[PDB]
RNA sequence: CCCCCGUGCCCAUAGCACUGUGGAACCACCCCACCCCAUGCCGAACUGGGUCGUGAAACACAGCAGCGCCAAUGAUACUCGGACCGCAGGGUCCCGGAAAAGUCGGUCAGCGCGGGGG
RNA sequence: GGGCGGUCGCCUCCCAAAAUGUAACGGAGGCGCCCAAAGGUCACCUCAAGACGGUUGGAAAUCGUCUGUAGAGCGCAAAG
RNA sequence: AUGUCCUGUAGAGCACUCACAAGGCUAAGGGCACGUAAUGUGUUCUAAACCUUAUGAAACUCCGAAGGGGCACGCGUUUAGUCCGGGAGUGAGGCUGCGAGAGCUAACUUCCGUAGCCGAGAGGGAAACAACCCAGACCAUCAGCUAAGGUCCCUAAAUGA
């Protein structure tokens, strides 16, 4: 949970336990690193939920969040991802997930566990933060109800992307 | 290049003292036998051209 | 239709003063107020002076164009005075294209 | 001010070979200096790890 | 000849592209761009076409002739810095 | 069960791909373009549905690519003929993702069945 | 330093929407209509003559993110090249060139250029 | 490979290995024209396409309208 | 070294091409339904498809280069830039790298080009063995070192750390 490191090359980015790391804060670029022990505390319970600190080698203190999740393609060795830090005035990419949880009231006619396989949501968030509080998956899966993406329990404010009408959880047992 | 009144046309102008056949065609849409024209010949100006054989 | 129609002749005009540069340009304006002229030599140029009223003032469309066609066909044509010119012909040809150009060579210009 | 040469031969494409038609030099055992053309400061940097400081 | 199904036995065909003048090279009225065998005048190949572009070139001598309506000819007045004479 | 016609063609080449997505439950990805005989993936879901349940629907992230052209064998010294084989080929994409619980990956246990190569399940 | 018919540079750091305003010199409508011009029909944006009236959306000006639009050396993706893991892909380091989205900002500019004014 | 069949000229490329840049019993569309005018000049007009409801009008053919990286069409593959 | 212009692969990405997944909505859509002047009333589901979520690619788009060519500035090695002619060869190759084509990405099978190699020269390594790591010679010396290969032996070289 410290920092230091420097290497402007993909040397110590492809050597056992490490990563690559990226930073672009207001007058703060460079490509650090850090090990990879309890470096999978992203999508666990810290997904924007709360924001500690870090104590970087030398100056300042930037809280920041997690900046979505990513893990690793196929394997499980998260190749370099990303990392947001609130100190910019206009990027995108928000992490507002939509899960699947419960006993699945699908045995009413025919239907299994809340599927969903995507990894993208209609979201927006002004500044850069991405709070942690939302459901959408439940609400009596049957007919004359449904619960998808279009408004819901929505972060804080409204939404902005292109055309508010994705798909996500839905029902259709 | 074929022969037998069906497709293709075989007409080719005629001009007095303006020796030239015009050497091009089209088709029998328009009248047959008769074939009024005008247009330049050897050079000079335009000459006869009235079609016939 | 003007700021939607007027587009036919613009770059297609400048193609004799820029494809030969041997002929002048020509402003040409509606307004039906004043008349003026204001030309510039060669497509690679667009700056020259002119004048105004302080002559004969009584608004018109027809007999008011042919006027400057000679009334001011050298008053502003300082450079060379005359040196192979071409008319604009933006819009149609009501007669302001006639009575102007047909009163152009009246005083000066070789068209 | 006193220049030398690297240490390699085969295993090098013709691109670097264009350092031969530039600065004529046979073998490696004995290397030498050079004119005064900074526009050559980038005509050896291919396999730099082979030469020395300048001795 | 004669053919049918389940077999085939037909030829194939192309032609010579042959671009010619190779950019920043003297000038004159060479040719270049046989995209269209009929071709046309050009005077001085600026490198036109749809969208912003035009071949960084500038090198007076004579006319040019080039390509089709595809990209673009030139005809520009300008040598490169020269403009007075020769 | 892929295209319906739209002419034959295609060539070869191996590497990886691009079709991995952060899964919502319990993922599963390929790892390079392994071996699945089409008429193997023609026994991918049914084998993953011996009796998982009366009903039940989840999600996959692939689709049959294929044709190959194998030709007889009376005297191989010619051109070609037609596909008559078929194959999927992939990268490290998702293909299962359960949403139940205790079962975990029972149907991602005999998925590796029809899999001469290595295809972990992972999770997300 | 004023408003302002206009020619470029240009080519969405001038697409649209919100407030209001100037009319007398800038610019719109209009008026009269048979005649130059004669509009697929008529003359309405293509017509000959102009002093009411008004500037209402269209003509102008600045404030003006709701999304566009320019948006970075910085990590990735891509790459002339060097030995290698290694199965073709794929991959480590050394190691140059060096996308894009995302980070801020700004967006309704700006300079010469022909004028009707206190 | 014999060879029945299948092949024998030109044109579109895929694969051709970002200048040129080949092959093939590897693959797909055809032809050896048109036109006195889809030729030259000057002029005005943005095309499929949805919506508004109204005709012989159980869609659709009629018209007004905004939208229209214009998605028409420009003589018959194809690229530009 | 440098000036200057482009090709547009690799990829991103998508919005004209072919298709791709989920949600809102779409039935000008269709039929299960006691109707029944369009059916005004009502319903249920893809489906075209707009937005969103956000898919693929040799033959996709306002993106974008390695490299390469064009000439120019200048010299480092040498005739490199520079045609007319007496006369060749014999047209039917192989392999590793670079990628595809017919192809259970199989074949010192077959087509292609690009460096090398053997058709015109030997070795160490490789058990000896055309392209593989190193290296291509004027004839003679039981003179030296480098790279590969090796440091236990049959035939060299520390079972040195």
PDB file of N, CA and C (backbone and C1' of nucleotides) in Angstrom, chain I residues 42-55:
ATOM      1  P     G I  42     -58.177  -0.011 -25.185  1.00  0.00           P
ATOM      2  O5'   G I  42     -57.871  -1.573 -25.124  1.00  0.00           O
ATOM      3  C5'   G I  42     -58.302  -2.352 -24.014  1.00  0.00           C
ATOM      4  C4'   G I  42     -58.045  -3.814 -24.267  1.00  0.00           C
ATOM      5  C3'   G I  42     -56.605  -4.237 -24.482  1.00  0.00           C
ATOM      6  O3'   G I  42     -55.940  -4.390 -23.235  1.00  0.00           O
ATOM      7  C1'   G I  42     -57.986  -5.274 -26.098  1.00  0.00           C
ATOM      8  P     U I  43     -54.340  -4.258 -23.173  1.00  0.00           P
ATOM      9  O5'   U I  43     -53.822  -5.702 -23.609  1.00  0.00           O
ATOM     10  C5'   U I  43     -54.332  -6.878 -22.988  1.00  0.00           C
ATOM     11  C4'   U I  43     -54.039  -8.087 -23.843  1.00  0.00           C
ATOM     12  C3'   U I  43     -52.578  -8.379 -24.106  1.00  0.00           C
ATOM     13  O3'   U I  43     -52.047  -9.135 -23.026  1.00  0.00           O
ATOM     14  C1'   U I  43     -53.796  -8.543 -26.131  1.00  0.00           C
ATOM     15  P     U I  44     -50.621  -8.734 -22.400  1.00  0.00           P
ATOM     16  O5'   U I  44     -49.587  -9.658 -23.183  1.00  0.00           O
ATOM     17  C5'   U I  44     -49.636 -11.074 -23.049  1.00  0.00           C
ATOM     18  C4'   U I  44     -49.280 -11.744 -24.356  1.00  0.00           C
ATOM     19  C3'   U I  44     -47.892 -11.473 -24.884  1.00  0.00           C
ATOM     20  O3'   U I  44     -46.974 -12.377 -24.278  1.00  0.00           O
ATOM     21  C1'   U I  44     -49.463 -11.265 -26.642  1.00  0.00           C
ATOM     22  P     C I  45     -45.463 -11.897 -23.999  1.00  0.00           P
ATOM     23  O5'   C I  45     -44.736 -12.086 -25.406  1.00  0.00           O
ATOM     24  C5'   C I  45     -44.058 -13.294 -25.718  1.00  0.00           C
ATOM     25  C4'   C I  45     -43.435 -13.212 -27.093  1.00  0.00           C
ATOM     26  C3'   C I  45     -42.501 -12.060 -27.398  1.00  0.00           C
ATOM     27  O3'   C I  45     -41.188 -12.295 -26.911  1.00  0.00           O
ATOM     28  C1'   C I  45     -43.976 -12.389 -29.220  1.00  0.00           C
ATOM     29  P     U I  46     -40.064 -11.160 -27.092  1.00  0.00           P
ATOM     30  O5'   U I  46     -39.365 -11.504 -28.488  1.00  0.00           O
ATOM     31  C5'   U I  46     -39.443 -10.588 -29.574  1.00  0.00           C
ATOM     32  C4'   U I  46     -38.290 -10.785 -30.539  1.00  0.00           C
ATOM     33  C3'   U I  46     -38.347  -9.916 -31.748  1.00  0.00           C
ATOM     34  O3'   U I  46     -37.740  -8.637 -31.487  1.00  0.00           O
ATOM     35  C1'   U I  46     -38.006 -12.118 -32.470  1.00  0.00           C
ATOM     36  P     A I  47     -37.449 -11.539 -32.159  1.00  0.00           P
ATOM     37  O5'   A I  47     -36.805 -10.913 -33.479  1.00  0.00           O
ATOM     38  C5'   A I  47     -36.804 -11.642 -34.697  1.00  0.00           C
ATOM     39  C4'   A I  47     -37.506 -10.889 -35.806  1.00  0.00           C
ATOM     40  C3'   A I  47     -36.985  -9.476 -36.003  1.00  0.00           C
ATOM     41  O3'   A I  47     -35.849  -9.465 -36.853  1.00  0.00           O
ATOM     42  C1'   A I  47     -39.356  -9.458 -35.937  1.00  0.00           C
ATOM     43  P     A I  48     -34.745  -8.315 -36.679  1.00  0.00           P
ATOM     44  O5'   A I  48     -35.269  -7.141 -37.620  1.00  0.00           O
ATOM     45  C5'   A I  48     -35.453  -7.368 -39.011  1.00  0.00           C
ATOM     46  C4'   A I  48     -35.976  -6.123 -39.693  1.00  0.00           C
ATOM     47  C3'   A I  48     -35.135  -4.858 -39.499  1.00  0.00           C
ATOM     48  O3'   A I  48     -34.035  -4.749 -40.400  1.00  0.00           O
ATOM     49  C1'   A I  48     -37.439  -4.377 -39.173  1.00  0.00           C
ATOM     50  P     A I  49     -32.565  -4.432 -39.826  1.00  0.00           P
ATOM     51  O5'   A I  49     -32.766  -3.146 -38.902  1.00  0.00           O
ATOM     52  C5'   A I  49     -33.378  -1.961 -39.410  1.00  0.00           C
ATOM     53  C4'   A I  49     -34.148  -1.265 -38.313  1.00  0.00           C
ATOM     54  C3'   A I  49     -33.303  -0.544 -37.278  1.00  0.00           C
ATOM     55  O3'   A I  49     -32.985   0.774 -37.711  1.00  0.00           O
ATOM     56  C1'   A I  49     -34.896  -1.906 -36.185  1.00  0.00           C
ATOM     57  P     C I  50     -31.592   1.442 -37.255  1.00  0.00           P
ATOM     58  O5'   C I  50     -31.981   2.381 -36.027  1.00  0.00           O
ATOM     59  C5'   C I  50     -32.211   3.778 -36.213  1.00  0.00           C
ATOM     60  C4'   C I  50     -32.480   4.449 -34.886  1.00  0.00           C
ATOM     61  C3'   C I  50     -31.385   4.284 -33.843  1.00  0.00           C
ATOM     62  O3'   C I  50     -30.363   5.267 -33.955  1.00  0.00           O
ATOM     63  C1'   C I  50     -33.489   3.771 -32.880  1.00  0.00           C
ATOM     64  P     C I  51     -28.915   4.987 -33.312  1.00  0.00           P
ATOM     65  O5'   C I  51     -29.162   5.078 -31.738  1.00  0.00           O
ATOM     66  C5'   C I  51     -29.472   6.323 -31.122  1.00  0.00           C
ATOM     67  C4'   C I  51     -29.759   6.122 -29.651  1.00  0.00           C
ATOM     68  C3'   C I  51     -28.673   5.367 -28.912  1.00  0.00           C
ATOM     69  O3'   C I  51     -27.631   6.230 -28.471  1.00  0.00           O
ATOM     70  C1'   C I  51     -30.785   4.431 -28.388  1.00  0.00           C
ATOM     71  P     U I  52     -26.173   5.624 -28.183  1.00  0.00           P
ATOM     72  O5'   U I  52     -26.395   4.669 -26.931  1.00  0.00           O
ATOM     73  C5'   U I  52     -26.698   5.209 -25.650  1.00  0.00           C
ATOM     74  C4'   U I  52     -27.162   4.116 -24.717  1.00  0.00           C
ATOM     75  C3'   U I  52     -26.173   3.018 -24.378  1.00  0.00           C
ATOM     76  O3'   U I  52     -25.279   3.409 -23.343  1.00  0.00           O
ATOM     77  C1'   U I  52     -28.281   2.062 -24.880  1.00  0.00           C
ATOM     78  P     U I  53     -23.892   2.615 -23.145  1.00  0.00           P
ATOM     79  O5'   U I  53     -24.326   1.087 -23.010  1.00  0.00           O
ATOM     80  C5'   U I  53     -24.725   0.552 -21.752  1.00  0.00           C
ATOM     81  C4'   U I  53     -24.760  -0.956 -21.805  1.00  0.00           C
ATOM     82  C3'   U I  53     -23.456  -1.655 -22.169  1.00  0.00           C
ATOM     83  O3'   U I  53     -22.625  -1.853 -21.033  1.00  0.00           O
ATOM     84  C1'   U I  53     -25.263  -2.583 -23.408  1.00  0.00           C
ATOM     85  P     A I  54     -21.039  -1.999 -21.223  1.00  0.00           P
ATOM     86  O5'   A I  54     -20.872  -2.326 -22.774  1.00  0.00           O
ATOM     87  C5'   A I  54     -20.683  -3.664 -23.221  1.00  0.00           C
ATOM     88  C4'   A I  54     -21.010  -3.768 -24.689  1.00  0.00           C
ATOM     89  C3'   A I  54     -19.841  -3.718 -25.642  1.00  0.00           C
ATOM     90  O3'   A I  54     -19.220  -4.990 -25.748  1.00  0.00           O
ATOM     91  C1'   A I  54     -21.528  -2.283 -26.430  1.00  0.00           C
ATOM     92  P     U I  55     -17.728  -5.084 -26.326  1.00  0.00           P
ATOM     93  O5'   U I  55     -17.807  -6.214 -27.451  1.00  0.00           O
ATOM     94  C5'   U I  55     -18.968  -6.371 -28.269  1.00  0.00           C
ATOM     95  C4'   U I  55     -18.817  -7.577 -29.178  1.00  0.00           C
ATOM     96  C3'   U I  55     -17.756  -7.451 -30.271  1.00  0.00           C
ATOM     97  O3'   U I  55     -16.471  -7.848 -29.806  1.00  0.00           O
ATOM     98  C1'   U I  55     -19.787  -8.290 -31.184  1.00  0.00           C
TER      99        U I  55
END
